[PDB]
Amino acid sequence: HHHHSIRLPAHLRLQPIYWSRDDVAQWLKWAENEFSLSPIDSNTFEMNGKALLLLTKEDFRYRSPHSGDELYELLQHILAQARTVFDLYFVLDKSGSVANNWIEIYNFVQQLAERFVSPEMRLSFIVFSSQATIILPLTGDRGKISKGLEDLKRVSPVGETYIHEGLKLANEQIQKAGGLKTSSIIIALTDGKLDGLVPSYAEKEAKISRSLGASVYAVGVLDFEQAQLERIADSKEQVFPVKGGFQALKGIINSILAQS
């Protein structure tokens, strides 16, 4: 049948894997009113969206004898709703300077790759030093992404810090994917210590990214050059320190999700 009209509150339209425990509770309140259900206790599902998605339909029925089957099917319909394809490009400094920090860069990327696993996400991994290389071409195939992560872990840092070459490969793929028609995010991990005219080259390439519609983030490693990262990223609000650990990861995750 094609007579379903499920429109969630705007702030609940993100894929349920990103729902907080409070989001789950709000979804229940919305559903009770939308579907004229009997009262749903606010603690019926004391868990976040990742956990909600592990429950079976039987679990829903046990938790809500009056409404669990309907809520489960509602969730399935929400999961089937089309969401805009979102493309994340990681542009990673493998120069000699960040050699003793490669694992820190890799681990930040792995954490973000593990977060952005909803089916509308596609990831690409690029590394740069004296030359830039696409390690993982843009894809939503989680098997290829896992292989891309294994390849990233084996990188041996060496060479100059020619970040413009890495940004160029993100821009080339964004152009091939549709340019302004795409939803594209670049995440550059670097200390931002650029030599010669590389600052000019990098800022030019980043402005090209923005002319293609992309939003540019910079994650700083080591004693990174904050001002330089601010000129590459869209703004200081899109510059995060890799040293901020979970708080920096949460900050950048929320910022990216808020581009949807």
The nearer residue to Na ion, 174 or 218, going by C-beta atoms, is: 174
Instruction: Examine residue 214 and tell whether it contacts Mg ion (CB under 5 A).
Output: no
State the minimum distance, in angstroms, from the CB of residue 211 to Mg ion: 22
The nearer residue to Na ion, 21 or 147, going by C-beta atoms, is: 147
Instruction: Examine residue 87 and tell whether it contacts Mg ion (CB under 5 A).
Output: no
The nearer residue to Mg ion, 174 or 225, going by C-beta atoms, is: 225
Among positions 95, 171, 215, 238, the unique one binding Mg ion when judged by CB under 5 A: 95
The nearer residue to Mg ion, 67 or 161, going by C-beta atoms, is: 161
State the minimum distance, in angstroms, from the CB of residue 126 to Na ion: 11
Angle, CA 171 vertex, CA 165 and CA 173 arms, to 5°: 110
Instruction: Examine residue 97 and tell whether it contacts Mg ion (CB under 5 A).
Output: yes
C-alpha to C-alpha distance for 250 and 228, rounded to whole angstroms: 23
Residues that bind Na ion in the complex, under the rule CB under 5 A: 4, 87, 136, 147-148, 151, 174, 177, 182-184, 213, 215, 231
Q: Which does 148 bind (CB under 5 to 8 A by kind): Mg ion, Na ion, none?
A: Na ion
Nearest to 194 by CA among 160, 146, 235, 152: 160
State the minimum distance, in angstroms, from the CB of residue 10 to Mg ion: 4
Both tokens of 116, joined, read 């952005």
Q: For 221-247, give one letter per residue: b (16+ CB within 10 A) or e.
A: bbebbeebbbbbbbeeebbbbbeeeee
Q: Which does 205 bind (CB under 5 to 8 A by kind): Na ion, Mg ion, none?
A: none
Which residues sit in the known binding site for a divalent metal cation? 95, 97, 161
Give the binding range for Mg ion (CB under 5 A) out of 100-108, 118-126, 188-196, 233-241. Answer: 188-196
State the minimum distance, in angstroms, from the CB of residue 136 to Mg ion: 21
Among positions 6, 22, 29, 131, the unique one binding Mg ion when judged by CB under 5 A: 22
**For the chain, after which residues does the C atom lie more than 2.5 Å from the next written residue's N, i.e. where is it broken?**
none
Count, residues in the chain: 260
Contacts 24+ apart (CB under 8 A), 245-254: 248/219, 249/108, 249/111, 249/112, 249/115, 252/112, 252/187, 252/217, 252/219, 253/112, 253/115, 253/116
Q: Which does 165 bind (CB under 5 to 8 A by kind): Na ion, Mg ion, none?
A: none
State the minimum distance, in angstroms, from the CB of residue 113 to Mg ion: 13
C-alpha to C-alpha distance for 70 and 127, rounded to whole angstroms: 47
Residues that bind Mg ion (CB under 5 A): 7, 10, 20, 22, 93, 95, 97, 161, 191, 194, 225, 228, 253
